[PDB]
Structure formats: C-alpha cells, structure tokens
Ligand binder design. Structure first.
Ligand SMILES: C[C@H]1O[C@H](O[C@H]2[C@H](O)[C@@H](O)[C@@H](O[C@H]3[C@H](O)[C@@H](O)[C@@H](O)O[C@@H]3CO)O[C@@H]2CO)[C@H](O)[C@@H](O)[C@@H]1N[C@H]1C=C(CO)[C@@H](O[C@H]2O[C@H](CO)[C@@H](O[C@H]3O[C@H](CO)[C@@H](O)[C@H](O)[C@H]3O)[C@H](O)[C@H]2O)[C@H](O)[C@H]1O
Ligand SMILES: *[C@]1(O[C@H]2[C@H](O)[C@@H](O)[C@H](O)O[C@@H]2CO)O[C@H](CO)[C@@H](O[C@H]2O[C@H](C)[C@@H](N[C@H]3C=C(CO)[C@@H](O)[C@H](O)[C@H]3O)[C@H](O)[C@H]2O)[C@H](O)[C@H]1O
Ligand SMILES: C[C@H]1O[C@H](O[C@H]2[C@H](O)[C@@H](O)[C@@H](O[C@H]3[C@H](O)[C@@H](O)[C@@H](O)O[C@@H]3CO)O[C@@H]2CO)[C@H](O)[C@@H](O)[C@@H]1N[C@H]1C=C(CO)[C@@H](O)[C@H](O)[C@H]1O
Ligand SMILES: [Ca+2]
Ligand SMILES: [Mn+2]
Length: 712
C-alpha cells in the first residue's frame, strides 16, 4: 500500500469519482515527525485551475494525520466537483503541494494523471516500438516533410528506469493530453518517439508531458529545439502550455545565405579578443545595435569578438550564465538568422566570433532538470542521468542544476552542442565558463576544488578534441583558474584566462602594492594564456581611479587617461593572446556594482569622443601587433621590470624578435617626473616617428610612457 510521497485511492484517479490522497513523509524529509495536520494546495490542468489563495486553511483542504508521517484527505463527491470544473472540461491532471498551516514549509509542484472517461480520456498501456532511425544524433526534432516531424526524447534514469508514459501536446491538438499523441518507448535506445503527420501552417508549438507512478507528471520542452517561447517574455506564449518553455519548429523556413569564402581568424596564435555583452554594448541591447558598431571594432584592430552567453537564458535581462536551452539562442538579442547575419558581418570585417558557453550548470527550466526532479527538495532527483541532486563543489553554487560531467549522456550532449554551434553559426571558437566546475569530487573551499581532478582534466581534453574534430583551427579558451591542470592542458593547445585585473587596477590607481604585471606573460607557453586587465567579472580600472586613486588620479581625467595608456603600453606589447572588456579602450568608469553587479550598465558612446586619446593609443598598440607580427611571435625574447620593486624609477620591458627587431617601453606610474636613460642603440618613437639617441637622459612626466622601436 503506502509508498513515499503521494498515494491515490483509487490507484487511477477518475475525474467524476471521489479521490483519497494520502501523503507519507519519507525519513529525512521536512515533514518527517511533524506533529500537526497538513494542508493541500492543488488545482487542475497545466495552469492549476481552482487553486486556492496560498495558506487557505478551510477544513476541506486539511490532510488529517491518521498515523505517524501519514496524512489523508478525500476530495468528496468528485475530483471535478471539488475544483468546480464543468462536466465537458477534460480534467486530465491534478497538481498537489502539501504545506504547514502557516504556509512556511511545503512540498513543490507535483502532478498526477486523472482518467476522464466521460470526455474520451481513457487509460491505455503505452506501446514498445523500435526507433525507426539509426544514425548519430537520434534524440531531438527531425523534420521529414513540410507537414511531418519525428520527435525522439531520451529517457533512462541513473538506476536504469524510465517513465510510464509520455504525451506530446501542442498547437496541433489544442494543448490536450490525447492517447493518439502517446509516444512509443524503445527499451534498447532508451528513447520515446512519435511521428506527427498533417501539421499545417508554418510554426508547430509543442511540449511533452512525461509521467511515472514514482515521480508523477511534468511538462517540459524538447532539449534540442532551435526556437522556443518563454512564459513571461513572449506575449504569444500559448494559454494551454505550462511555463516555462514551448518548443517551436518551422518545417520550411527562410534559409540564411552566407557570404562566400573560408574566413580564418587573423593573428590566430595570439589574438586580441574584445569581450562584448549584447545587452549593454548598445542602447537597443541586441544584434541589430551591435552590427552598426562593427566598423568601430574593425578600426580598433581586434582579431575576435567574444560574446557573453547567447544561448537561451532565464528571462531577457541577463549576463546569460543561466542557460535553460542549449540549441536555441536567446530571442531577446535576435532571431536565428540575425545571429548568422551578425557573425557573417564580423567575418566580412575580418573579425572572428567566439561564443561564451556555460556547461557547469543549467537552470530549473531545462528539460534535463524537469525530466528527473525532486518535488520534496526542489532540485534534481538522485535518478537524474545528466545532473547532480546537490552541487559537489559547495564553494560555487551558481544554480540548483549542476551537470555531472562523468555522465556519458552529459558528455554526448555537450559534444553534440559544440558541433551544432560550429556547424550552424560558423563561429571561430569557444570560451568555456567555469571549467573548474566540471568535477564530481565533494569540496567546500577553493584549495580542495583547485587540486588536480584527473576526471576534470580528461573531460576537458575530451571537449577540446571534439571541437578540433569539427574545426581544426577553432580557438578553445577555458576560464579554469586551477594552475596545475592549466600547465597539463596548455600542453594540449587549450588557452586559459589569465586575470591581471588586480595588478593593473593597482597601477591605474598609482599604488605600487600588489601591482606586479609579471603574471601576464607565461614563460613556458606565452601563447596559451589570454591576459586581461578587465573582464565582465571585474571592477573597471578607471572606476578605481575615481574612488581610491593616488592624488590627482581621483579627479584629473587627463592624468587618468595617461596612466591607463601606460597600463596599455605594458599590455598590448606583451606576447600571447590579450582580452579587453567592452569600453576599456575609452576608460569606461562606471562601477561594476552600479545597478547591481549583473544589472544593466549605462551605454556611454560619447566616451569614444571625450576619451579619443585613450582609444587612439589602444588602436595604435593593437595595430602594431599586425604591422610588426614577427615581433610578437612567442619565439621573441621578452624581459621586463614590473615587480613591487620596479616603481620609484619606472618600469621597462624589451621584446627582441629572432630577426633583430626590438621594442622597448618605459613608464612612470608615479605622481612625479622621473629621469630615465634610454638603452644603447638607434630608437624611434614609433607611436608619433623621428629618431632618438640611446644612452640619452630624458625626463618622463608623471603617468606617461615612452615606446621605442629599433626600426621604422
Ligand atoms: C566569478 C568566478 O568565480 C570563480 O573564480 C574564482 C576562482 O575559482 C578562484 O580560484 C579565485 O581566482 C582568482 C584568484 O584568487 C586571484 O588571485 C587572481 O589570480 O584571479 C583568480 C581568477 O579571478 O577567485 C575567483 C573569483 O572568486 C569561478 O572559478 C569562475 O568560473 C567565475 N566566473 C564565471 C562563472 C560564472 C558562473 O556561471 C559567472 O558568474 C555570474 O553569473 C552567476 C550566475 O548567474 C552569478 O551568480 C550569483 O548570482 C546569481 C543571481 O544572478 C545566483 O543565482 C547565484 O546563486 C549567485 O552565485 C554571479 O554573480 C555572476 O558573477 C561569471 O560571470 C563567469 O565569468
Ligand atoms: C507560495 O509562494 C509564496 C512564496 O514562496 C514566497 O516567496 C512569497 O513571499 O509569497 C508567496 C505567496 O504570496 O504561494 C504560491 C502561490 O500559490 C505557490 O505556488 C504554487 O501554486 C501556484 C498556483 C502555481 N502556479 C500555477 C498557476 C498559475 C496561475 O496563472 C501559472 O501562472 C503558473 O505558471 C502555474 O505554475 C505554482 O507553480 C505553485 O508552486 C508556491 O508554491 C508557494 O510557495
Ligand atoms: C587607498 C587604497 O585604495 C585601494 O584600496 C581600496 C580597495 O581597492 C577597495 O576595493 C576597497 O577595499 C575594501 C573591499 O571593498 C572590501 O571587500 C573589504 O576587503 O574592505 C576593503 C577595505 O580595506 O577599499 C580599499 C581602500 O580602503 C588600493 O587597493 C590600496 O592599495 C590603497 N592603499 C594605499 C593607502 C595607504 C594608506 O594611506 C597605504 O598603506 C597603501 O600601501 C597604499 O597602496
Ligand atoms: Ca530567455
Ligand atoms: Mn559543476
């Protein structure tokens, strides 16, 4: 008789008969050993028709405690009568939460099936049928014709089980559960499948209703959809559909015409990457707005644009590290073809495109989450074959839905997604967010998490090789911050984020403490470390000047732009890839905390004019890496004096190519003029270039730098 959670007498609920619901609290569950009665919060259909006001303690909602940990309620006369549902309304699901009288403790959204014989909704045994397709990529949406789609949904839990039945519901059947739209299970491929025929018009909209005795029922969309509507964002979200997502398929849509040619990233070994958030890059916050600035970024001299995450994220106002769907791009920035047009336009301006991708975690809206959910703890169940119930790395819990990168299903999904983004959107590489998170080890801090995990190392190689198999020259960058695993993986050709924000903020402010630049240059493999003074995750160097700058650096914009141009002179002149965060080149100086860390920031394109002196220095330093590439080859000899102890008298670097070409830079980061003797040789002021005698004493004013080449 009674199992954990909800029990029904009758075992198959009947819309036009009474129902006894018995709730049994498992050991370790929040209502285990609870002394008082519980209350029912319930309604019918996708949208909980008949739900009371939360906390409504009328006696007809009371589950009387009958035994220890067992509460029962009877929906008397009939389920239909209890919810005042019209006879003709198909009553096909009931949604159940139990709570304390106060409404402080509860269970979470759960649904069971209701048989409604009087409206033609009769129980049938689900069919076992082999999947009629072989091939790779069996799961997902297959368009066979203008009027027909095959749907394949993976279902095997980590204990070897599967659901009792799955319905497809959509615009083709007015969002009803219908025995005609029950999918068939293939026990060998572990997949539900159905062929929808006689679809009419352009857009098919659907979601699945999955159901088991142990888990109850859930609505979810297809994980592989390329288009989705999101309740609370899309005004056209169907009234029949449950939040959050409906999959959208166009059988014969407008194909995008790509311009002709290969396209390959320029300076592919050591690119300058421009990190860009579409939400905040222009006032329209979208691809259309950003497309208008490509001429600006082209002139700047950048090799690549890195977009912050564009995969479908929760809502329409986000950095995007909250992915709900991985094969649909967020419609808040543009359509599929607007993304393709953007990427095509970048390629025609000679600019590569990198996508920021977030595989550590998804969110509660993801079909992989919804499919195997714990309605007691409101997190993935211990049976979920893609996700952990509980994040193993407890120092970093960015959502309730942490991916298990030891799951063969998760690895296959990630590998398939990488290939999809390469093939469909023609991008030039990837920045993998938080690759430190790709670990099953139980940890609670930074040092236990950063310790070598051989399975994390091996899975990151696996994802690297999967990208390389699709596109041999694709750039693969990982935001890792595990020093020892970076040494190992840099050997394979993986690039790593190298955060020099603290040092370059200290130098921008005129403070010598913790200002050492030396971590920008990795002696073992200079080209594998993507150095940056700023990223979306960091405070702006120019903001720190205003708030805490040494002396005049708080108030004098001229002296601030000079100090930042001197930082740039100790950054774009260093071998290996470089990254700048949008508007760093114009001294963007709004705190990361203005409007909250992740909130929309002011759009300040007038800075391009007011701080043109800084934009022009960025432009010339970036362009030097093209004009004199051979200088920035990893083979060049690179030395510099940029420690805590290199300050009172200035800082220096020298880059010497094998062909004899030399670059030398001096900077005075102090608040007073310094005397400096140029090194021996014949030098030119390349940024502005008449000759200069070596071993010649010069007075370098506060905040300024001198750049010399031994050529012109
Ligand atoms: C933010 C960063 O956190 C980690 O980085 C750690 C690092 O692992 C640790 O080693 C150390 O590294 C420093 C070192 O101490 C310094 O000496 C120097 O060398 O620099 C290194 C590198 O900085 O300190 C780092 C900083 O703490 C992690 O490893 C990185 O991957 C992280 N950056 C990524 C990842 C995420 C998560 O996807 C992004 O975070 C943004 O978005 C999330 C999710 O929305 C936000 O999460 C919070 O707010 C949410 C509500 O919006 C909540 O739902 C959630 O529960 C909250 O956690 C978060 O605030 C955003 O920053 C990030 O932007 C990516 O770039
Ligand atoms: C509770 O929510 C409380 C919050 O937990 C607390 O943070 C806040 O201060 O107070 C809230 C109450 O004021 O009450 C919710 C409302 O009943 C309850 O939601 C459950 O039941 C509702 C009916 C479900 N919503 C469905 C119905 C509609 C109505 O159109 C649709 O818009 C939704 O998409 C449907 O899902 C909801 O899903 C349930 O969880 C909370 O559980 C409860 O904590
Ligand atoms: C003047 C001082 O400015 C800078 O220090 C500031 C930090 O940059 C800010 O981030 C902020 O740090 C606070 C954190 O926000 C907070 O999380 C918590 O950790 O408290 C921190 C406050 O201590 O505020 C700092 C200013 O208090 C800059 O980094 C720092 O080097 C500057 N220090 C100079 C000043 C003195 C004394 O006048 C000398 O001793 C130092 O050597 C100078 O460098
Ligand atoms: Ca969205
Ligand atoms: Mn993780």
């Amino acid at each position: 008789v009674l199992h954990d959670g909800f029990n029904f007498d009758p075992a198959i609920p009947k819309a036009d008969e009474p129902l006894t619901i018995t709730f049994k609290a498992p050991e370790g569950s929040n209502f285990y050993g609870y002394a008082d009665d519980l209350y029912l919060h319930s309604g019918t259909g996708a949208n909980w028709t008949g739900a009371p006001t939360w906390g409504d303690n009328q006696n007809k909602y009371r589950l009387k405690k009958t035994k220890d940990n067992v509460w029962s309620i009877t929906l008397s006369s009939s389920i239909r009568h209890f919810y005042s549902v019209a006879p003709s309304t198909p009553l096909q699901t009931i949604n159940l939460i139990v709570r304390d009288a106060e409404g402080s403790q509860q269970t979470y959204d759960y649904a069971t099936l209701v048989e409604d014989s009087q409206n033609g909704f009769i129980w049938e045994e689900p069919q076992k049928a082999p999947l009629p397709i072989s091939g790779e990529e069996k799961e997902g949406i297959h368009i066979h014709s203008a009027t027909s789609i095959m749907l394949v949904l993976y279902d095997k839990d980590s204990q070897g089980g599967h659901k009792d039945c799955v319905f497809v519901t959509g615009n083709f059947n007015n969002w009803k559960l219908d025995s005609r739209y029950m999918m068939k299970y293939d026990e060998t491929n572990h997949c539900w499948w159905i062929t929808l025929e006689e679809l009419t018009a352009g857009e098919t909209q659907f979601q699945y209703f999955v159901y088991s005795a142990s888990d109850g029922g859930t609505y979810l969309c297809d994980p592989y959809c390329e288009q989705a509507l999101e309740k609370g964002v899309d005004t056209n979200f169907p009234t029949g559909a449950q939040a959050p997502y409906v999959s959208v398929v166009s059988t014969n849509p407008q194909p995008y015409q790509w311009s002709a040619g290969e396209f390959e990233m320029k300076n592919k070994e050591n690119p300058v990457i421009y990190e860009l958030l579409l939400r905040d890059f222009t006032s329209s916050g979208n691809l259309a707005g950003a497309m208008e600035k490509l001429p600006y970024l082209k002139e700047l001299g950048i090799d690549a644009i890195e977009l912050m995450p564009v995969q479908e994220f929760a809502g329409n106002d986000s950095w995007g590290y909250n992915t709900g769907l991985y094969f649909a791009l967020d419609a808040s920035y543009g359509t599929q073809n607007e993304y393709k047009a953007f990427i095509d336009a970048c390629h025609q301006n000679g600019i590569a495109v990198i996508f920021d991708v977030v595989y550590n975690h998804t969110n509660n809206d993801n079909p992989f989450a919804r499919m195997y959910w714990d309605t007691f703890n409101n997190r993935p169940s211990t049976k979920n074959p893609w996700l952990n119930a509980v994040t193993p790395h407890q120092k970093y819990v960015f959502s309730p839905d942490d991916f298990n990168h030891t799951s063969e299903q998760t690895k296959a999904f990630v590998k398939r997604n990488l290939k999809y983004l390469l093939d469909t959107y023609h991008i030039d590489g990837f920045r993998f967010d938080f690759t430190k998170g790709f670990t099953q080890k139980q940890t609670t801090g930074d040092d236990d998490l950063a310790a070598t995990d051989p399975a994390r190392v091996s899975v990151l190689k696996e994802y690297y090789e999967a990208v390389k198999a699709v596109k041999e020259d694709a750039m693969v960058t990982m935001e890792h911050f595990c020093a020892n695993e970076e040494t190992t993986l840099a050997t394979e050709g993986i690039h790593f984020w190298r955060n020099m924000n603290h040092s370059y903020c200290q130098s921008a402010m005129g403070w010598k403490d913790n200002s050492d630049f030396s971590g920008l240059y990795d002696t073992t493999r200079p080209n594998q470390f993507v150095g940056y003074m700023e990223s979306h995750d960091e405070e702006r160097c120019a903001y720190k000047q205003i708030e805490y700058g040494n002396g005049a650096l708080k108030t004098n914009l001229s002296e601030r732009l000079k100090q930042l141009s001197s930082n740039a002179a100790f950054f774009f002149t260093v071998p290996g890839p470089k990254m700048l965060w949008q508007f760093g080149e114009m001294g963007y100086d709004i705190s990361i905390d203005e409007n909250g860390r992740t909130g929309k920031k002011p759009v300040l394109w007038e800075y391009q004019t007011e701080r043109k002196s800084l934009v022009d220095i960025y432009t010339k330093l970036i362009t030097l890496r093209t004009t004199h590439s051979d200088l920035f080859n990893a083979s060049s000899q690179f030395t510099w004096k940029v420690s805590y102890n290199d300050w009172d008298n200035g800082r220096t670097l020298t880059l010497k190519a094998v062909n004899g070409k030399q670059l030398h830079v001096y900077a005075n980061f102090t608040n007073a003029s310094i005397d400096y003797t140029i090194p021996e040789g014949t030098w030119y002021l390349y940024l502005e270039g008449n000759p200069v005698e070596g071993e010649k004493k010069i007075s370098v004013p506060a905040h300024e730098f001198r750049l010399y080449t031994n050529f012109a």
